[PDB]
Design a protein around this ligand. Structure first.
Ligand SMILES: [Zn+2]
Ligand SMILES: [Zn+2]
Length: 65
């Protein structure tokens, strides 16, 4: 089938700006939500979350090395 997102996350709206869903995903137990470029920088600036990293939404590839 075609590329698509999982129903366990869906298009969750960015609660920081309240404008739209973010392109970057955070899998950390602290976040577990999407953020925009500016909202992501604001969220992860605080110490204790500086180990986080922006991921793609769902799998960008079914299988790889
Ligand atoms: Zn995070
Ligand atoms: Zn945002």
């Amino acid at each position: 089938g075609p590329v698509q997102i999982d129903p366990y996350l869906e298009d969750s709206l960015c609660h920081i700006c309240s404008s739209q869903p973010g392109p970057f995903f955070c899998r950390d137990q602290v976040c577990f939500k999407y953020f925009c470029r500016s909202c992501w920088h604001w969220r992860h600036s605080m110490e204790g979350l500086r180990h986080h990293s922006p991921l793609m939404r769902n799998q960008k590839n079914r299988d790889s090395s």
